[PDB]
Design a protein around this ligand. Sequence first.
Ligand SMILES: O=C(O)c1ccnc(=O)[nH]1
Length: 160
Amino acid sequence: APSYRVKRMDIAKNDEECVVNAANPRGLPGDGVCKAVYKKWPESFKNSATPVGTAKTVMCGTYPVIHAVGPNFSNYSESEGDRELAAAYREVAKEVTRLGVNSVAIPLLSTGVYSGGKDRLTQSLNHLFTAMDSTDADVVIYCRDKEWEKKISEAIQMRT
Ligand SMILES: O=C(O)c1ccnc(=O)[nH]1
């Protein structure tokens, strides 16, 4: 029976069969979060460039890295941002299904340096749910803040 779980820890130490990288459209290593993914799976960044609102899988050996590019809300309108953030998660669902994996480690896209200084926990998480509800993979959501862990954990609780 496929579950959603949340873990407050480095996504680069996930124990799922694949990872989603919160990526930039240039396929650049990045800093903070993407840096952890670059350091862990540097060969997954070969031709990882993909436009905003898309996802691209690059294998690191047999381990799939799904580069998913949420919008930078600094650059987008609230309405266009929202559209691009929905589409990014939909492309993630498609890659997870295509790969036939049983589990996936996923961050909340567009909630860090791409949030345009706003709190987007509920926006990002609902788009994730919309996309991943139609898949049969175990989903493990990774976050850093304890407050965020609690809020995500409750949003999971109150749909079961
Ligand atoms: O702000 C973020 O967490 C983020 C950085 C890069 N790509 C994203 O989808 N999101």
